[PDB]
Amino acid sequence: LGALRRRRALFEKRKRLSDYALIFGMFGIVVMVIETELSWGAYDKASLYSLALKCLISLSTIILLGLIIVYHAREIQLFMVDNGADDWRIAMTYERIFFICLEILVCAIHPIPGNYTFTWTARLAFSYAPSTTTADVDIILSIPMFLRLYLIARVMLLHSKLFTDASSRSIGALNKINFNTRFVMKTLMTICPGTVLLVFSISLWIIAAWTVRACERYHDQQDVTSNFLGAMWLISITFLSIGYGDMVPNTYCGKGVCLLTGIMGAGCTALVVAVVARKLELTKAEKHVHNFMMDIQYTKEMKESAARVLQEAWMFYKHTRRKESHAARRHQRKLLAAINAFRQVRLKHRKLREQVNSMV
Amino acid sequence: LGALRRRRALFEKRKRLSDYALIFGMFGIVVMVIETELSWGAYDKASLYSLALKCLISLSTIILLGLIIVYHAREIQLFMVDNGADDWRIAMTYERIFFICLEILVCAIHPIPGNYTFTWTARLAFSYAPSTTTADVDIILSIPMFLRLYLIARVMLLHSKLFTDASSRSIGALNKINFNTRFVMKTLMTICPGTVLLVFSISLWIIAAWTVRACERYHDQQDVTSNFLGAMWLISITFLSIGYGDMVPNTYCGKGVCLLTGIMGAGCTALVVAVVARKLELTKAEKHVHNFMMDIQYTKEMKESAARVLQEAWMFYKHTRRKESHAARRHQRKLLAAINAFRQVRLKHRKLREQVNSMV
Amino acid sequence: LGALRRRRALFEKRKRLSDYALIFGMFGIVVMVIETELSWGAYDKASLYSLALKCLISLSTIILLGLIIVYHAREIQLFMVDNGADDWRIAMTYERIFFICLEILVCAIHPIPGNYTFTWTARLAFSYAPSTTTADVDIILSIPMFLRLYLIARVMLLHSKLFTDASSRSIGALNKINFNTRFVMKTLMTICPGTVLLVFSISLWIIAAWTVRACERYHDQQDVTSNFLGAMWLISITFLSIGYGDMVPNTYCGKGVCLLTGIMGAGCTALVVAVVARKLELTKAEKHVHNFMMDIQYTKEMKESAARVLQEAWMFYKHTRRKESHAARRHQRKLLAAINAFRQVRLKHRKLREQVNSMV
Amino acid sequence: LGALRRRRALFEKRKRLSDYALIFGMFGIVVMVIETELSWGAYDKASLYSLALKCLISLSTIILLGLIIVYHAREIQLFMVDNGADDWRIAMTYERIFFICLEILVCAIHPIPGNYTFTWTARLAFSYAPSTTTADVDIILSIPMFLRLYLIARVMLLHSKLFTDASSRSIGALNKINFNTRFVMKTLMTICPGTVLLVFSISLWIIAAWTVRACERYHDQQDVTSNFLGAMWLISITFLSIGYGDMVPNTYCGKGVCLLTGIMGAGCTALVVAVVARKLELTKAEKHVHNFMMDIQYTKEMKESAARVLQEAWMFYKHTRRKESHAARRHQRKLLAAINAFRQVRLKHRKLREQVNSMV
Amino acid sequence: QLTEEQIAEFKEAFSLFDKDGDGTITTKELGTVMRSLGQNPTEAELQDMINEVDADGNGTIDFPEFLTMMARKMKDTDSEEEIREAFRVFDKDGNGYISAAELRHVMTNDEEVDEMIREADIDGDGQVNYEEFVQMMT
Amino acid sequence: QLTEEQIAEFKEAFSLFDKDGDGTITTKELGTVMRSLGQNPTEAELQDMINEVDADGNGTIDFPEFLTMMARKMKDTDSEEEIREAFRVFDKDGNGYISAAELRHVMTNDEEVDEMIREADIDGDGQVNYEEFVQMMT
Amino acid sequence: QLTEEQIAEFKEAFSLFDKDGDGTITTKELGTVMRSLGQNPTEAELQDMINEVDADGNGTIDFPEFLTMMARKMKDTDSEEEIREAFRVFDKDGNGYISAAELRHVMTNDEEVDEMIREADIDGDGQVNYEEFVQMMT
Amino acid sequence: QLTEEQIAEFKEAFSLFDKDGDGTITTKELGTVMRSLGQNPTEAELQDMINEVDADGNGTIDFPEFLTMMARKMKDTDSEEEIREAFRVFDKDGNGYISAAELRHVMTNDEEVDEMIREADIDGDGQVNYEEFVQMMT
Numbered sequence A, B, C, D: 001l002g003a004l005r006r007r008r009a010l011f012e013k014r015k016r017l018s019d020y021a022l023i024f025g026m027f028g029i030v031v032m033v034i035e036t037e038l039s040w041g042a043y044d045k046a047s048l049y050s051l052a053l054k055c056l057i058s059l060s061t062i063i064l065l066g067l068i069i070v071y072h073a074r075e076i077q078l079f080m081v082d083n084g085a086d087d088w089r090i091a092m093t094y095e096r097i098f099f100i101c102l103e104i105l106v107c108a109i110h111p112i113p114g115n116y117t118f119t120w121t122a123r124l125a126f127s128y129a130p131s132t133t134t135a136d137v138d139i140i141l142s143i144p145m146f147l148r149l150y151l152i153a154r155v156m157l158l159h160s161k162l163f164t165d166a167s168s169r170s171i172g173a174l175n176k177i178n179f180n181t182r183f184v185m186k187t188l189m190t191i192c193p194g195t196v197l198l199v200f201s202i203s204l205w206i207i208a209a210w211t212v213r214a215c216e217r218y219h220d221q222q223d224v225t226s227n228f229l230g231a232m233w234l235i236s237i238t239f240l241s242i243g244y245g246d247m248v249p250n251t252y253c254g255k256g257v258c259l260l261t262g263i264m265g266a267g268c269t270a271l272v273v274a275v276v277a278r279k280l281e282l283t284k285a286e287k288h289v290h291n292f293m294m295d296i297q298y299t300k301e302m303k304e305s306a307a308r309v310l311q312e313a314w315m316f317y318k319h320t321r322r323k324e325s326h327a328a329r330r331h332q333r334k335l336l337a338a339i340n341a342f343r344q345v346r347l348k349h350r351k352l353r354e355q356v357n358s359m360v
Numbered sequence E, F, G, H: 001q002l003t004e005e006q007i008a009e010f011k012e013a014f015s016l017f018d019k020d021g022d023g024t025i026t027t028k029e030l031g032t033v034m035r036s037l038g039q040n041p042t043e044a045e046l047q048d049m050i051n052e053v054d055a056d057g058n059g060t061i062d063f064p065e066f067l068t069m070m071a072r073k074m075k076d077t078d079s080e081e082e083i084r085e086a087f088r089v090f091d092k093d094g095n096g097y098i099s100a101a102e103l104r105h106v107m108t109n110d111e112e113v114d115e116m117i118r119e120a121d122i123d124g125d126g127q128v129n130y131e132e133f134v135q136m137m138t
């Protein structure tokens, strides 16, 4: 009982630190977007507004790094409490240190205050004419800022009900299930697949479109693929694997984003196919009700088709006995057609009965 | 028994009002198409013919709004009779009022009589040259008129046999099933998937093609993508995700229709895959007959292959005893080949027997 | 016994007439291809060679029509013998007459001898420049000659073993199965799907490529899409839904063939997906062997991981008792890693045991 | 026992020869790539460096042919030992000789030392302007050198654990399983499908890109599709079936490589779909945990919904008894909403119970 | 009364369960129909369901009782069934009588519950039953 | 008579059911084949379907009887089986005899049915049997 | 001690197994829950796993014992269970006692194993038991 | 003789069937392994397949007998099993002895078969047995 209290008090701190890290990461990304958009036309990179906004980004990044460090300290304490260790060096393996350094590196890339520039040259598309420019260096540090979206997955995993619930944890432990983020992803894809597939793709559509526009606004004097509704058209027709061609990227960054978009679209067609195939299958009760309704329908059709068979047979007999030939032949043709129809409905009814018997 | 009579008398009125609303909505759409096509070349937007046709559209829209209101009044009365209420204010929730207003807004968008114009500017494709025009305002009200096709789904649901039949209603309610339009869609996709997929896509092909042509005939002095068989080519190669490029939309409306076409094509490839996968599977009786036929075939093959094995073995023995070598090695090779073939057919027969035993 | 002899003697005649009709149809198509290819450059449409070749096509078409008529007479006699009729008018329904007329019309379209021309105007692609020509009328009659390939399906169905075999027919009728061409297609797709999908698509590749080249050689002064290896490139990138764009059809015929190619490619991706999904599944005999091998592997891994756990635990204990700290901490870390690895392999073994138990 | 030791010694010799053949084949391919890259700009085809590198390729090819011959001799000896033959002519069938000759021909194609050239003409894309160059003949022999990658499959099959293990071979023999390379491919695709699909495609990406660049550097004065990152862009957008169009091959070799890339991309979409569909499914141990958690959730929801039903019913009763109307109607609406919500949650709980009973 | 078409449709629905045509729906016929629908009903539950609409208590459902059941089942939501299910899930102990303890427990998901008990206990037996619950709900 | 190839194929089809080679298809062998085909025939139904072509009534199918069964089963549709099934579904009561009540009932899905009964009752027993049904059909 | 929220959640988890609410988890209730989870535990294995945390040996799990079981089960990996499983797979003969032969055999997948045995036999009974194994592990 | 690695691998394969480690594979252990592989062997077939390699006839497979079985099973195709299966399918009557009638019948799928019989009957008993079949095959 001396371990459960500490473990819960550390679960709460870990969750709160994840929440705050997500808040500060998203604030940094949003201010980066605002500053990148404004510094193009509203003011220049030497203005005091740019200095203030980049100072805000840096001050958010410092606090984010602090929160990441404190989160990892809490997780080290959790490892201590779990595996009954006493020295923190025991918890520090090679993989853990590598992942701590990876998170710190990912979360420490941001536009540093100050004006720096580099010469950017690209080959224009459909004309192959070189175009050079003096682009700022803050654009190769703004794009990596979108890597802070792993905090979203961390927060989703940590806030999930069955991750922290005592009863859910016990039931998972009896069945030896690991509650990693893949289990959460699978449960989401089996509960609400359409909602996940519609949020995860329309939230990445805007990100890819903004990345393409930001990368290509330096080599675009026509406002064709450096316009937001143009970049968002390019990315959509790349994701859907249409690829018209009138808007093809000029730069390596735009081409890379379009390649990544194409890869993810080819990986999302598989998800769409799986979801659609699982959404057409009839539920067991629905299939039983449908089979019962079709059984009633086939019995009614069989009754009326047998009635028609006898009606046509008698009409043919009456016309034959009435010393008539042409109408007798017409009604013999109708009798043959009625017999064929009766055979068809009988076969359909038998197939339905076989399916029902196999199901039950 | 005092409620069943009223409920049936209201079911009939509800169905009749749905039928009339569909009739008037389709009449409005058809007259809109006729007037849009004629006012381009036959006459001008100031002519009396245009005034007469737009008056016809407006008079159809007024009656459609009246029928929608009366249908919702009948549905309110049905709610009263079902849940045993007495005051109609009880039936009026927030969602119901929102949906009533949504239907009224959707069904009240039509070309108002009179000449109104707005300046439309677009960036031409593959040349990026701006093109401005004085386009009429009736084209941004004609395109939304295709939203009246939800009345088609409403009529299909209301006219369905199992929605109104007392027998089907009893059987479904015994199994606790909701008879919404998704159940109808699933039953259609499991009974006649090809017919539904061929009607729902070739009827939307014409609609998308007409929308593209109508939107882009204002910025097309070459009759390339403003020709009906050209718009119908563009839409088809977008839906199939080919996307050649020679016909890429100029305007935002054409680009939006092409994006919607691409999305629906990427969603219909999943339906095609599911339907094809469900149409290749052999039914139980067909699989049993096929397995029986293959069992007979494999038994015949095994008989003839054992015969060949013994024939080759004896021929090799006879040539060996006949003081011959070259024919002896030829027939030893043939005997080894015959033994391998016999092993292959025996393994195939064993696999077939295992499959039959697992199935039965 | 007086009906079985007649029925078999008519089955044989029906099969022979189908064979001869296929022979003459393919001969007509081949001579059409030869004449179309030669009359472009080798000679002109007024030459005697063209007259001779078109006379050969016409004389093959006359015999094909005769064979179709005789085949339908034999099928009428088969209907007589089956349904015990006596007057041939009884067998002549509306559908049968419609299909007889449809086959005769399909098989009577061929290049008539004589020179006739019509003015063909097309809009060139990527330049929208009109191009007019005086094209022969024999090209709108040569392309429909590829509709004679239904005789291929008829011959495949009539020559199939289970269609005419007495035992196969008895077993099929005992299970109430119709031996139509869809059953044959399904059995082919379940026996040899790759072979069918590779023959039916590479034989239509040549047909579509030749049709595109034949239709577009009249409006192509650059030998770009009127070259056989260029048309065969266009058709291949359309079928695979790549659609580069450098070769986009000029004429309505080329565009229609490319649309049909795109549709069939979007319908064949579904077949490819189904075949691949059915070809990755492990059979029961393979799955049992794989599970046994993995069981042996997991037992060996579990043995060695328990050995490592005890080895590391003892090394840590020995270093602790040896008044050492740094190596004791290193070996405690190694012991924790070994315990985690042992847990992982134990969980994998338990999952394998659960899967084996569920399968058996 | 006199055959087992010989069979194992020949297994070991066969495996070692396969390893050495793979080593020498890969060395030849690597030196071919180095020489092809260097001879473009670093030196010319008449230099002594080119002579030395091509002599190295030839000396690797001679040793590779020797190793292939010795490997086939070892297989002949294995056939002798297996089928108890005495004369090696017994083992030399037609298929075996054909495959020996095929491997020797495939492994004997390499750049012969010496300067030989041929005139290469191609039609440029999007301009259709002919371009002629005096290209070396060593480029039509370098590209076929990538066919030596079948040694990779041979080494993977021969080194596989279950191919040579005695216990695995015995277990496979009891179940009559053939240990061909298709079984190995299926086991790999069922154990680690993502890793195989990510190695086999990102290792062919560089091969196709290098082939395109090598073939088209002779007809590219703009360094657009003859640049490695440009060829690797073209191949990637062809594999994903986007096909922009700005980079479309000029020569027949580039077009053929792009056609093969498109075919393999259309065949790999099926593998992606199958893998993704098999990776979304929840295993039994996860399905049971998920169902238990959702059952607990639904019971809690039912409790709170019944609480709301009674609370709203009592509030409505109290407001009715308190001579109030507006609040009475509002709370009656709330009670009806609560009853509907309770019905919905009860229905979904019943559906969960039905699903649990069906799977258990 | 009901029109001819309604009577014909409801007689067809009745004959769905009435296989032998004797005019009454024996519990065995309802059981076999629900088995054909994929359900697995116990005899106790079947009997409980068949006396839900059995007005005369004879143990079988004739045409008028079936008409009442249809007039209560044709609507999208049946208030009586939902009220009964709510009362059932209120009764944790399953004895058919909800005391103040269960109500106080389920309200927490003092004066108000006391007023509810006071105004719901029509017979003054110190507890709440099904008839009191349906009286308070309506 | 039948040629050598036809009789050979039909003998092979006969031996496909005749495992023991005694020349007669016992009902047990037909049931075993039917079970191997995935169907589950009852003994009563199997016996009823084995006397359909059994002309001599010996209880087994010899070669000529099997030839007759094939000669009526090779055709795509046989009028005899469809007529029998129609007569079976006409007889709701299952007694083998259709009276005027069932005829009038199934005709609604007066003078015409009276004429049908009058001209269909060949023996004048007041009711319609299977022989009268097949006489009227042909 | 534990806070109100923790004890409430653990009481809910305890009642998830404790249907009758008597305060003790009998082996039958745990078996029923395990069967509802898809597994099939034998009575012997179930009893063996129920005395693992049963400190007083009364045969049932009270609340404090369940709290101890949770306190050792909440962690991602518990050393006790892994050590026990390793000891179980060490004992090939299944007698509960590992002698030097099995140790030497499993170490091959001389002086070192002798030192291990010498320093692991705390009681000097000539063989290694579970208590000695857990003493050496910690 | 076999090297250390080969004998170790074959001993492991032998112990894969030999659970109890007594050195002999009883038919029960082989049946259990076969059932674990998904197949269902009858006792008669299992005994028949266990005496194929049992040289001494003791009823169990020792290590040398298992080595012989592996030495004839490691190869991709063994002529002995294929010859035995061919002889089995030759003998339609199942009596173990093929007479001239079955040979003449299967050869149609006069002098040649007479020569085959004359040169295949080594003992001159007038009929062909398994030993004569394997003598003629080799």
Ligand SMILES: COc1ccc(S(=O)(=O)Nc2cccc(C(=O)Nc3cccc4nonc34)c2)cc1
Binding pocket: A263, A266, A267, D197, D198, D200, D201, D202, D204, D205, D208, D235, D236, D237, D239, D240, D260, D261, D264, D265, D268, D269, D272
């Ligand atoms: C559409 O399915 C996909 C499968 C896997 C992947 S992936 O990201 O793992 N690999 C990947 C990424 C980008 C380009 C390529 C690429 O062009 N490959 C190839 C080129 C030429 C011949 C090939 N034969 O096989 N692959 C080939 C591959 C993505 C989508």
Ligand SMILES: [Ca+2]
Binding pocket: E018, E019, E020, E021, E022, E023, E024, E025, E026, E029
């Ligand atoms: Ca009854």
Ligand SMILES: [Ca+2]
Binding pocket: E054, E055, E056, E057, E058, E059, E060, E061, E062, E065
């Ligand atoms: Ca009653």
Ligand SMILES: [Ca+2]
Binding pocket: E091, E092, E093, E094, E095, E096, E097, E098, E099, E102
């Ligand atoms: Ca109570």
Ligand SMILES: [Ca+2]
Binding pocket: E121, E122, E123, E124, E125, E127, E128, E129, E132
């Ligand atoms: Ca009371």
Ligand SMILES: [Ca+2]
Binding pocket: F018, F019, F020, F021, F022, F023, F024, F025, F026, F029
């Ligand atoms: Ca018999």
Ligand SMILES: [Ca+2]
Binding pocket: F054, F055, F056, F057, F058, F059, F060, F061, F062, F065
């Ligand atoms: Ca007989």
Ligand SMILES: [Ca+2]
Binding pocket: F090, F091, F092, F093, F094, F095, F096, F097, F098, F099, F102
């Ligand atoms: Ca009757």
Ligand SMILES: [Ca+2]
Binding pocket: F121, F122, F123, F124, F125, F126, F127, F128, F129, F132
């Ligand atoms: Ca009679």
Ligand SMILES: [Ca+2]
Binding pocket: G017, G018, G019, G020, G021, G022, G023, G024, G025, G026, G029
């Ligand atoms: Ca208890």
Ligand SMILES: [Ca+2]
Binding pocket: G054, G055, G056, G057, G058, G059, G060, G061, G062, G065
């Ligand atoms: Ca206790």
Ligand SMILES: [Ca+2]
Binding pocket: G090, G091, G092, G093, G094, G095, G096, G097, G098, G099, G102
């Ligand atoms: Ca031991």
Ligand SMILES: [Ca+2]
Binding pocket: G121, G122, G123, G124, G125, G126, G127, G128, G129, G132
């Ligand atoms: Ca001890």
Ligand SMILES: [Ca+2]
Binding pocket: H017, H018, H019, H020, H021, H022, H023, H024, H025, H026, H029
């Ligand atoms: Ca043993």
Ligand SMILES: [Ca+2]
Binding pocket: H054, H055, H056, H057, H058, H059, H060, H061, H062, H065
């Ligand atoms: Ca022995």
Ligand SMILES: [Ca+2]
Binding pocket: H091, H092, H093, H094, H095, H096, H097, H098, H099, H102
């Ligand atoms: Ca014999």
